[PDB]
Symmetry: D2
C-alpha cells in the first residue's frame, strides 16, 4: 500500500541504496517506527509494509538523502528528506511517494490510487 520511487536528477537513473524509515503518528503527537529499508537499484522498496500495518493515520517517511549524496561524491544541502502525510488506505488505495533528488533540491510528490 506504501511504495516509493526515488530518482536521481543528476544521473537520470533511480537512486539506489537510499535508507529510509516509516513512522506512524501516535495519539500524543509522537512517532512509532513501523518499518525501515533501503531502496534497491530501481529506487524502490518492495513489501515495505503490509495492509494491516498501514491503517488510517499520519505517517512520516524519512529518507537519508545526505548519505546518498555523500556516497555519490557530492555535498548536499538537506540533512534528510521527510515526507509527512495523512493516509486513508480504505480498500484499494495505494500510495506512491515519488522523490526527485538533486544535491540542493528535491521534489516530493504523491500518487494515490482510488478504489
Amino acid at each position: 500500500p506504501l511504495m516509493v520511487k526515488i530518482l536521481d536528477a543528476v544521473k537520470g537513473t533511480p537512486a539506489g541504496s537510499v535508507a529510509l524509515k516509516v513512522s506512524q503518528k501516535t495519539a500524543d503527537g509522537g512517532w512509532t517506527q513501523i518499518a525501515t529499508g533501503v531502496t534497491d537499484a530501481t529506487g524502490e522498496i518492495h513489501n515495505l509494509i503490509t495492509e494491516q500495518q498501514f491503517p488510517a493515520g499520519v505517517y512520516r517517511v524519512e529518507f537519508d538523502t545526505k548519505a546518498y549524496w555523500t556516497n555519490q561524491g557530492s555535498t548536499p544541502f538537506h540533512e534528510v528528506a521527510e515526507v509527512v502525510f495523512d493516509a486513508h488506505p480504505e480498500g484499494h488505495r495505494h500510495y506512491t511517494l515519488a522523490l526527485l533528488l538533486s544535491p540542493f533540491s528535491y521534489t516530493t510528490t504523491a500518487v494515490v490510487s482510488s478504489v
Copy 2:
C-alpha cells in the same frame, strides 16, 4: 519500447490521463518531422509509441498538450505546451522514460535512461 512517458498531475495526486502528445525528429535541413502521436492512458503512459527502428540517434522533440489538459480540468494554465527536446543515444540498449510532473503554472521534465542505479 525505446521511448516511454510518465505524466503525473500534482494537483490531484494521480497520473495525468488523456494527455495528447506528439513526437518529432529533427531533419537534416534543421526542420522537424512528426513521427508519432499518442494520448496517455489512465496510468499517465503511452505504450508502443515508436519502435527501435524509428528511433536512431538524433534530436527529438516530444510536445505535450498540457494547455488542453488543464483547460479540461477547469483550471487556468500558464504554458501553451510542454516541450522536451533531447539528443537521443539509443545505442547500448538505452531506453528513455520522460517523466513529467504537471501543475497549472509549473512543470518538471526529468529523463530516466536506465531502470537501475550505478
Copy 3:
C-alpha cells in the same frame, strides 16, 4: 537577513501568502528548540525572520504549514507539512534562501546559499 524564504504557488502562479512557518535549531541532546515563527507576506517572504545572533552554525529545521495553506485555498492536499532540514554555516554573512514551490500533491524545496 541570513535566513530567507520564498514560497510560490504552482497552481496560481503567484507567491504563497500567509503561510505559517517556524524555525527550530537542533540542540546538544538531539532535540529541537523553536527560535522563530512567522507568516509569509503577499510576496511569499518573511523579512527579519531571525538575526545573525540567532543563527550560529548548527542544524536547522524550517517547518511550513502547507496543509492550512491548501485548506484555505479550497484544495485537499497530500502533505501535513513541508519540512526543510539542513546544516547551516552562516558564520560569514552567508545568506540562506529556502525556495519552496507548492502544489496540493507535490512540493519542491531548493536552497540558494550566498
Copy 4:
C-alpha cells in the same frame, strides 16, 4: 520590466550564471520572430530584456541554452535546450517571471505573474 527570468542551479545551490537565452514571439502564420537575446548575470537574471511596448499579448517562446550551461560545468545534460512557451497577457500591468530550476537530467519551469 514585463519579462524577467530567475535561473537556479540545483546541483550547486546558486543561481545559474552565464545562461544564454533567446525570446521569440509567435507570428500570425505560426512562425517565430526573435525579439531579444541575452545571458544571465551571476544572480541568474537578465535586466531590461524587453520593454512593455515590445511585449503585447501573444504567444512567446523563451529558449534557454541549458546544454551549454551543463557542458561548461563539466556535467552531462539530458536536454538539448529548455523551452518555455506561453501566451502572455500583460494587460493591467501584469509582469512575468520565468523561474527555472536546473539539474543535468531535470528542470522545473514555473511562472510568477505579478501586478508589480
